Nucleic acid binder design. Structure first.
Lengths: 923, 920
RNA sequence: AGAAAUCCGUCUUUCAUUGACGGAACACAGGGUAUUAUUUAA
RNA sequence: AGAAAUCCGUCUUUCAUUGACGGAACACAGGGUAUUAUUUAA
């Protein structure tokens, strides 16, 4: 029982001059000792034998390679700091064979036959072990004895058996009773570092041992993976297909400045074979199959294949092959990985040192609370090492309003109680009234406000008293004075199992990166689901939103797409001016206003406008002269910094993030154009900075904005989903991920964040594999039937344009290519419902720009005849439609209709996708 | 740990001619035996003795009166059908003292000293018992002995010890008794040859009637004795004379008078009305109005204002303690004088056949491809003329019973207890390929079959999991059958735990219900009354919605079309008012009053109520020949285009409209007949005079009753669905699980009926000032209350706002007014208008010097910049409540009078208050 | 074991032969506290 | 135990000294398918 979770806090210590020097000296002492154990432990682990690896490997599920474990511990790439006995990339195998008494394994030969860091060199750890045995004055076998004991007692970590924390110090030096070298080891360590202290030696050992063990295990896995890479590297029959794929770059399809390796995912992987199969249809519109496949790949899992290279493959499709080219792409991948990725080196690292029971308890705290301001300090009582050598405890203060608010502030409520004072845990601070009168520096106002609210709560007798029962708090401090504080708490008895009455939910991600949730209940009786093996019921549906108010107006940071067209006329007007005055880009036609009009003719919202205008500015900058670029430089600055720039406005929507990316592209295109970079002179970050420092300043700021925006978006999505769970007694959450030890940054972030957050509220998280969850029919798919449907959209017939017919034709010609078939049949249903079958053949003839194309007003007249007027609503099977025709009511607000003589629920498609993940068991 | 629930079905049996005679003969035989058993059991119970009552009453929790139990069983008022030994209304005390051997108690004497039904007479049960002992050929003590044995063995029901269900028949007849043979011969001679089931049913009917009436008479006699003690308590009857001299006085124009009970005066709180009246005379009824509002808000009946106006006339002289005691005296005297004692008559209950319905799994189905077999069969034992009992099949029809249970499911995996939306199953909707062609008088039922049939072809119909082995069926002389299905539900509790979810619900002044959903949490904000930590989940409004071509109407609160959308109806109404002219002071030719309606731009149902009142007023004075045409216009009002017989939601507005239309017809009848106080009219005269209009009276009352029933059911359904969607396990409402509104009583009793079906636990409490309590602050621990506010733009502050401010300000003394008083104070302090306070104290109804509304508007516009700003005004029945915490969904945070406040839906606050109540 | 039957009801200036839905049973003198759109703009 | 300190961040043509809010930590060739109102009426 007892689920446990950790919440942590971060700040920087603010000691005075004496204590600051004490802390820095203590931390430097701890580094110096840590590096010393690093070298000595490097020698010890160099001294291990195969038999030891046998005892440590008795219990493992997978039969382990002893020779490789011995190799990774006996030879390491290290920095100059921890290098004693150098060895060359030739002598490695020769000496290994000498040490093991057998032929060097093929996997070990790959480990040795590897690229190494520029600043890292090889080291013979066994020879280091022998020289350590002399420098200790003991016989080799005595220290081998002691090492045998330590590995047995799990005092040290061996191949797959991790150590028991820091027991080695108490076992060996604190006075597992038979040592040969104990006195020598203790004197060696004590002479080289500092006088015996259990805590200090423990921290030194921990840092050194952690670095060495993680890098050794990484090298073992790396050697096996590299051997498999090599075994596949010779697999190719002939690099003829590989040369033609690589020669893609030479041909006219690629105009890019710089070349890149062609990996399997660029081709779409396995489905490219399906693509050729769809290509067998004819070359009538290879493009439609390209687009459908790419769209499906981007929707489900992998990165969308780049279309250009696939058009070039379409050029050579008959000769080269499907299997042969795709294996050729695999060859490109494997060779580049084999050559590029170096072997992991063993270097000390920059982790901090942890003081145990370092924070004074909140009830035992000392507060200088004044009536007009509380005491916002949290004190640590650390042991520090003076120059003389004695250890004494000193008080060091730090500031953290979050830690103060959630835990550290003293609550004075007689009856009220809480674990953490934060809205996600159920507590809201009383808002500030118009009597507040905060007067402090601006650079503190936010923090001051928090204090005010807390103090107000204390004044009202409202501040709840924490019930965490904290007995000790650790604190982890680094050389920069940054402190990290973990609070570990108990949550509740563990569930894990899904009974009747239990509530679960699923969540899915849109193409526009907007999330949606679907909440279900396990019921005693009703509708049966074969995958789950129980009876399910639909509770509710909705979208994930994170809302803030600005003078009473609500903005959803996660999906706000900006001002509508008519509301940013002036900004548009300024853009118009710049586009008018300036004139076209490199075919030297189109003096810019035409494109601007095209952007404005769609009447877009503000952030889409900003993205498209950023694309237009990079295009404009592209050809222009060095003297011309000065003028444009000024306008770029107003675009990025004034009135509506991404540095001033932008929500957390996908639109805003791509706008920032496009603005970065503007600056990069500026730098390329001015520098005339090409294959002869590949401009670097350094050259951009030296050339133009301020615009590099802008580039840095933009990447910073971007990173913070992504982090904030992930945190907010997780928060919104957790609140929705908390209000609806949801006990289980399912998302697109796997919990073991191909992805989107948003999908990865949200999944790992919910993994972090759900155990705090005793909510159990599951991961699954979302394959075509956008199209599966809830309660029908895999129960037991395996049923799919297409996505629809609802549009008034007055606005059926040429693109509706283009989409209809494209969906109809795509029966063979994967997700296309559901769309093909969808069009069939459409034709069956509105009785337009006669047009089908003419729709087959609908090609890109034919004059003889059946026009849209024909369709409008037929649909108006069929529905009476031009304002009636029709449903059209289109990709990424917002309407899903569900067999059952599995979305909130879904309505019931009859389409093609079939009972149907008009549902939010995204809500259907969320339900489909909620009903998934296979990951 | 296994609670039970019952769902029942009602229908009518449709046997053929032969089986119809068999069934009617069986039922008539069963009545005849039941009536015989009634007379004989009346005699047997006439023979009980005090010692028997002791032996049955030893283990009573309370102290019981044996003499009264003996008396109520020894003398009964009966109908002529079961009357044997007539006894006169004088001789009872004498004969009772003869039979008991002691002085007849005054408590027992009151039961004898009573009014009785016109067609009911007293019965000497002792002499009937004596002669029954004769006719059996036995001695008195032998049957006293067997009666003792029967009473001891819980075979018969004596005062507090209910009988065993039907052990008597098997115990006394089924094969150290003394008389067994004589009694068996007696029953079998009079009734029919021994059958355990038939004799059991006969006995059950007779015995049940007798025991209910005996216990009821015991309670009635005790209550009457206390009423007599309190009626005779009052020394000087002068004050009551002053009340009815009120009746003679001018404050009354109604056709007929009535007894003046305590609740007409406001009860206890009337004393404070004096205390309020002592404050200041000049403006008397302001305090009166406050109390009426106060009384209507709580659980009480509104005192009629007219009587208090006269009471104020005589307040100084007639006194306060004397007036309320005198009103209690009138109440007690009329109750005592005109409530009869409960008589023992056989009754119309039906007879229950056990295991009478063929199981659904063993049923015979003549299923055709275009129509299923919608018959449910019974296999009943019936008595032929020869005397033998034989089983026959009789079919009946019930689409609800068929849909929920009886139809066979063909889904491999789906399952259900009942196929109804409240239990989680929705029938597949009909497609445009359905093609139903049947009689119109069946289309609804046909539609149900179609849906079920469609569900069957799709493999969708879930298989019931009720595990039914036997079903009873209760049949009466009219062929009406009732079928109870009893099902297993789950292990309840009264132990709210952590994670348990509860809710409360309250009812508005406009009969609009609201619900508040809370959770018991491990940590957070403590509630002293509950003894736990609570958290607020959500809040809402109870709605029951139906669609009409995609437009949603809430039956519970739809107030009808908006003004501009019903011009035509108004034109007709306007024309009729135009042509016609005023009513009795015979001024004000009707149109102007009509415009008084239209100037407020009301919605349709409010318009219909007010216009119905106006037709009533018109009808009042008019001549007999004139009424000729007014009748036809009344008819169009009630029957065409928008009359209540065609439109009307379930809102309080529509019900008041129906009440007003009935008032119209009653005023018609009075006006046409020129009935008066000494020349009264009866229903018989109304029917004979104008039969068709009495037919509309019938139809209107039927509509009223059906609408009320539907409203109660829909409110219960909506609340139960809301609970089911939110894992709510507890419900709390204003009731007690054993002074009321029919809606409050009905909703509480219906939720009591429905919640145990979903393993939901219902609690009742006492809603006192729940409209004003501050959630999580009231009784935590201090008792804090607040007034109700409303939000209005300053452009529309009128004279009535100033009136309400003045009235609330002068009402510090009278109960809830105190809170409203402070509200106005807070109001002024917030808007910095304290200077006006004194002038607001001078604001009387129609003064010329009144501070006008535009002063306030100019001042408030100054304070808030514009005339479109929103201000909060303390008004009675306001829709806004200023809560200490966020205890309503959609609540916003403001600062009022330098106090942080949540603007909450007031009704939602009341629901939260009901949810946090533990004392009833 | 006999093809008939609205089980009882509700809503809508919409009364619907595919409109949408709900139900254990018993037995006061004259009435305060709008929706689609879309038009020249802000 | 020393009166200072935005812990780190987000939103808004609103940048706020009472605006509203969120967070365990580690370590490619040129862009893809509106809201308040209230005005002559229905």
């Amino acid at each position: 029982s007892m689920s446990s979770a950790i919440k942590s806090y971060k700040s920087v210590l603010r000691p005075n001059e004496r204590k600051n020097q004490l802390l820095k000296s203590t931390i430097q002492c701890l580094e110096d000792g840590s590096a010393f154990f690093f070298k000595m432990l490097q020698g010890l682990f160099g001294g291990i034998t195969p038999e030891i690896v046998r005892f440590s490997t008795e219990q493992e599920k997978q039969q382990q390679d002893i020779a490789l474990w011995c190799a990774v511990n006996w030879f390491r790439p290290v920095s100059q700091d921890s290098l004693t006995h150098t060895i060359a990339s030739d002598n490695l195998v020769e000496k290994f064979e000498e040490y093991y008494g057998g032929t060097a394994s093929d996997a070990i030969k790959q480990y040795f036959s590897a690229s190494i860091g520029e600043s890292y060199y090889w080291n013979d750890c066994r020879q280091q072990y022998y020289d350590l045995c002399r420098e200790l004055g003991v016989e080799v076998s005595d220290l081998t004895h002691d090492l045998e004991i330590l590995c047995r007692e799990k005092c040290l970590a061996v191949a797959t058996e991790s150590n028991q924390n820091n027991s080695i110090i108490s076992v060996l030096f604190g006075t597992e009773r038979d040592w040969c070298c104990q006195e020598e080891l203790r004197s060696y360590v004590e002479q080289n570092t500092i006088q015996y202290d259990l805590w200090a030696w423990g921290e030194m050992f921990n840092k050194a041992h952690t670095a060495l063990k993680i890098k050794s295990t990484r090298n073992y896995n790396f050697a096996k993976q590299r051997l498999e890479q090599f075994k596949e590297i010779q697999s190719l029959n002939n690099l003829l297909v590989v040369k033609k794929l690589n020669d893609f770059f030479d041909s006219e399809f690629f105009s890019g400045e710089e070349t890149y390796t062609i990996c399997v995912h660029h081709l779409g992987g396995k489905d490219l074979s399906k693509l050729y199969k769809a290509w067998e249809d004819d070359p009538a519109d290879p493009e439609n199959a390209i687009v459908v496949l790419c769209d499906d790949l981007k929707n489900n899992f992998k990165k969308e294949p780049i279309r250009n290279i696939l058009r070039y493959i379409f050029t050579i499709r008959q000769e080269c092959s499907a299997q042969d080219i795709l294996a050729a792409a695999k060859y490109n991948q494997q060779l580049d990985r084999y050559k590029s990725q170096k072997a992991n080196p063993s270097v000390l690292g920059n982790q901090g040192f942890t003081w145990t029971n370092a924070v004074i308890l909140p009830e035992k705290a000392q507060r200088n609370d004044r009536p007009n301001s509380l005491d916002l300090r949290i004190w640590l009582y650390l042991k520090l090492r003076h120059p003389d050598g004695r250890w004494k405890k000193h008080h060091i203060p730090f500031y953290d309003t979050r830690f103060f608010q959630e835990i550290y502030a003293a609550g004075n409520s007689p009856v009220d109680t809480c674990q953490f004072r934060t809205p996600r845990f159920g507590y809201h601070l009383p808002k500030l009234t118009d009597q507040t009168a905060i007067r402090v520096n601006k650079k503190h106002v936010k923090a001051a406000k928090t204090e005010a609210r807390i103090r107000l709560a204390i004044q009202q007798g409202t501040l709840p008293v924490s019930n965490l029962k904290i007995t000790e708090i650790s604190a982890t401090i680094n050389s920069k004075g940054q402190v990290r504080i973990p609070v570990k708490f108990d949550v509740g008895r563990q569930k894990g199992t899904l009974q009747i009455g239990d509530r679960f939910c699923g969540y899915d991600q849109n193409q526009t990166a907007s999330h949606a949730y679907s909440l279900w209940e396990v019921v005693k009786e009703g509708q049966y689901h074969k995958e789950l093996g129980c009876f399910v019921r639909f509770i509710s549906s909705g979208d994930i939103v994170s809302i803030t108010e600005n003078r009473g107006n609500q903005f959803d940071q996660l999906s706000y797409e900006g001002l509508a067209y008519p509301q940013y006329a002036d900004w548009r007007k300024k853009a118009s001016k710049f586009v008018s005055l300036w004139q076209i880009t490199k075919i030297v036609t189109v003096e810019a206003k035409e494109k601007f009009d095209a952007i404005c003719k769609y009447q877009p919202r503000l952030y889409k406008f900003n993205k498209e205008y950023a694309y237009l500015l990079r295009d404009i900058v592209r050809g222009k002269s060095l003297v011309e670029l000065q003028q444009i430089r000024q306008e770029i600055f107003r675009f990025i910094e004034q009135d509506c720039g991404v540095t001033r406005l932008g929500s957390l929507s996908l639109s805003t993030l791509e706008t920032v990316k496009a603005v970065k592209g503007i600056i990069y295109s500026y730098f390329s154009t001015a520098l005339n970079a090409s294959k002869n002179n590949p401009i670097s970050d350094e050259q951009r900075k030296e050339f133009d420092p301020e615009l590099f300043a802008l580039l840095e700021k933009l990447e910073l904005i971007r990173t913070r925006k992504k982090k904030q978006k992930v945190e907010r999505i997780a928060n919104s989903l957790i609140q929705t769970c908390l209000e609806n007694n949801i006990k289980f959450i399912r998302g697109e991920g796997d919990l073991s030890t191909s992805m989107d940054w948003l999908a990865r972030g949200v999944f790992n964040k919910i993994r972090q957050l759900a155990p705090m509220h005793n909510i159990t998280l599951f991961g699954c594999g979302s394959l075509y969850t956008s199209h599966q029919d809830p309660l029908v798919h895999r129960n037991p039937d395996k049923a799919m449907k297409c996505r629809w959209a609802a549009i008034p017939v007055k606005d059926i344009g040429d693109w509706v017919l283009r989409k209809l034709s494209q969906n109809l010609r795509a029966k063979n290519i994967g997700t296309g078939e559901y769309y093909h049949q969808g069009v069939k249903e459409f034709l069956s419902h509105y009785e337009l079958q006669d047009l089908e053949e003419e729709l087959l003839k609908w090609r890109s720009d034919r004059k003889s194309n059946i026009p849209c007003w024909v369709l409008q007249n037929r649909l108006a005849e069929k529905l009476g007027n031009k304002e009636a609503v029709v449903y059209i099977p289109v990709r990424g439609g917002r309407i899903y025709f569900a067999t059952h009511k599995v979305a909130t607000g879904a309505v019931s209709i009859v389409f093609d003589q079939k009972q149907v629920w008009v549902c939010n498609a995204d809500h259907v996708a969320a339900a489909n993940i909620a009903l998934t068991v296979k990951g």
